[PDB]
Design an enzyme around this catalytic site. Structure first.
Site, mmCIF file in Angstrom:
data_model
loop_
_atom_site.group_PDB
_atom_site.id
_atom_site.type_symbol
_atom_site.label_atom_id
_atom_site.label_comp_id
_atom_site.label_asym_id
_atom_site.label_seq_id
_atom_site.Cartn_x
_atom_site.Cartn_y
_atom_site.Cartn_z
ATOM 1 C CG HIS A 62 99.031 37.008 58.554
ATOM 2 N ND1 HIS A 62 98.046 36.733 59.497
ATOM 3 C CD2 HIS A 62 100.249 36.516 59.073
ATOM 4 C CE1 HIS A 62 98.616 36.156 60.587
ATOM 5 N NE2 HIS A 62 99.981 35.985 60.311
ATOM 6 C CG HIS A 92 94.395 37.727 66.259
ATOM 7 N ND1 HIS A 92 94.935 36.738 67.053
ATOM 8 C CD2 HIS A 92 93.497 37.110 65.419
ATOM 9 C CE1 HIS A 92 94.381 35.509 66.687
ATOM 10 N NE2 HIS A 92 93.532 35.733 65.673
ATOM 11 C CG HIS A 94 90.668 36.494 61.567
ATOM 12 N ND1 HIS A 94 91.622 35.860 60.879
ATOM 13 C CD2 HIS A 94 90.819 36.143 62.871
ATOM 14 C CE1 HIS A 94 92.375 35.100 61.727
ATOM 15 N NE2 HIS A 94 91.909 35.283 62.950
ATOM 16 C CD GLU A 104 89.518 33.341 60.805
ATOM 17 O OE1 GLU A 104 90.174 33.146 59.752
ATOM 18 O OE2 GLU A 104 89.880 32.965 61.939
ATOM 19 C CG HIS A 117 90.000 34.967 66.667
ATOM 20 N ND1 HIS A 117 90.538 34.400 65.575
ATOM 21 C CD2 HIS A 117 88.644 34.667 66.634
ATOM 22 C CE1 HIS A 117 89.623 33.831 64.827
ATOM 23 N NE2 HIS A 117 88.410 34.026 65.472
ATOM 24 C CB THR A 197 91.399 30.171 61.787
ATOM 25 O OG1 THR A 197 92.003 31.457 62.146
ATOM 26 C CG2 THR A 197 90.369 29.770 62.837
HETATM 27 N N1 LIG Z 1 93.259 32.829 64.380
HETATM 28 S S1 LIG Z 1 93.476 31.837 65.771
HETATM 29 O O1 LIG Z 1 92.928 32.508 67.030
HETATM 30 O O2 LIG Z 1 92.948 30.486 65.385
HETATM 31 C C1 LIG Z 1 95.242 31.572 66.042
HETATM 32 C C2 LIG Z 1 95.817 31.786 67.279
HETATM 33 F F1 LIG Z 1 95.165 32.326 68.354
HETATM 34 C C3 LIG Z 1 97.176 31.532 67.476
HETATM 35 F F2 LIG Z 1 97.590 31.802 68.705
HETATM 36 C C4 LIG Z 1 98.018 31.038 66.494
HETATM 37 N N2 LIG Z 1 99.428 30.620 66.691
HETATM 38 C C5 LIG Z 1 99.900 30.608 68.068
HETATM 39 C C6 LIG Z 1 100.906 29.477 68.220
HETATM 40 C C7 LIG Z 1 102.049 29.704 67.226
HETATM 41 C C8 LIG Z 1 101.852 30.843 66.229
HETATM 42 C C9 LIG Z 1 100.434 30.918 65.647
HETATM 43 C C10 LIG Z 1 97.377 30.796 65.250
HETATM 44 F F3 LIG Z 1 98.081 30.281 64.191
HETATM 45 C C11 LIG Z 1 96.019 31.095 65.028
HETATM 46 F F4 LIG Z 1 95.541 30.798 63.815
HETATM 47 ZN ZN LIG Z 2 92.370 34.403 64.753
#
Ligand SMILES: NS(=O)(=O)c1c(F)c(F)c(N2CCCCC2)c(F)c1F
Ligand SMILES: [Zn+2]
Length: 258
Positions: A62, A92, A94, A104, A117, A197
């Site tokens: 994804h 990473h 979005h 987001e 992020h 998120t």
């Molecule tokens: N897009 S975000 O930055 O809010 C975000 C994130 F940074 C994560 F580390 C994770 N996780 C980390 C912990 C377990 C796996 C997924 C996640 F789901 C996620 F949505």
């Molecule tokens: Zn994210």
């Protein structure tokens, strides 16, 4: 996996398996600047990352992730709303299907083309990411809104890497990179308590949303969208989007450092 961004498995559907999707501390949010509370207890954000901690880039179907070695405090976030230092583990992005949406978070309803992020876990209190991820104070994520305009040369190593991880599950080494080079030159920010998120959507994140956007070109956004969500050999399925809609504040206060 049980979830994605498609019509059937996407954000509208997450609550079926993850009822926290409808919780009180869900992310992302629309930041309404006339409802923010300026707060003098905040300190400036301090990032100190060691490029030797960059480890790998991986296609997770994804999205794609750039992961860092997180066995010690070589790369850390401090300051802002935090008393603990938070250890870098990943960044990473979005994005959306067209330039007109994709971030987001939004600000006064305005959608940006993508969002960076940069994610960290509280190594003062917890001993691992998996322990920290479910704790209210476990995670700190910097969100940087990306505004379609001039190509951003700071994205170059990341984009040049994507050709090695075209399809789902492909991994490659990604070394010697300090992701504070991707942040805007002003670190003024908003902060609020929120969540991951996408599933599992745990309400464990203190968000740090930069006021200043960074740029990205239309062609750079295309490179994200041309990553493939299928495994090698299958019909190519591009990753067109992976942003969640904004969620209700439910009474939280977004605080501004500025
Ligand atoms: N897009 S975000 O930055 O809010 C975000 C994130 F940074 C994560 F580390 C994770 N996780 C980390 C912990 C377990 C796996 C997924 C996640 F789901 C996620 F949505
Ligand atoms: Zn994210």
């Amino acid at each position: 996996p049980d979830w994605g961004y498609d019509d059937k498995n996407g954000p509208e559907q997450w609550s079926k398996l993850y009822p926290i999707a409808n919780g009180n501390n869900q992310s992302p949010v629309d930041i309404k600047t006339s409802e923010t509370k300026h707060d003098t207890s905040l300190k400036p954000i301090s990032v100190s990352y060691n490029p030797a901690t960059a480890k790998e880039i991986i296609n997770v179907g994804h999205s794609f992730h750039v992961n860092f070695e997180d066995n010690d405090n070589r790369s850390v976030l401090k300051g802002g709303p935090f008393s603990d230092s938070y250890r870098l583990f990943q960044f990473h992005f979005h994005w959306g299907s067209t330039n007109e949406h994709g971030s987001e978070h939004t600000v006064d309803g305005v959608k940006y083309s993508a969002e960076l992020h940069v994610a960290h876990w509280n190594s003062a209190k917890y001993s691992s990411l998996a322990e920290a991820a479910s704790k209210a104070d476990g995670l700190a994520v910097i969100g940087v809104l990306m505004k379609v305009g001039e190509a951003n040369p700071k994205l170059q190593k990341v984009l040049d890497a994507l050709q090695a991880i075209k399809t789902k599950g492909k991994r490659a080494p990604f070394t010697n990179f300090d992701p504070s080079t991707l942040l805007p030159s002003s670190l003024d920010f908003w902060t609020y308590p929120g969540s991951l998120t996408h599933p599992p959507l745990y309400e464990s994140v203190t968000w740090i949303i930069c006021k200043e956007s960074i740029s990205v070109s239309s062609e750079q956004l295309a490179q994200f969208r041309s990553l493939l969500s299928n495994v090698e050999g299958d019909n190519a399925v591009p990753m067109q989007h992976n942003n969640r809609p904004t969620q209700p504040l439910k009474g939280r206060t977004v605080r501004a450092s500025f």
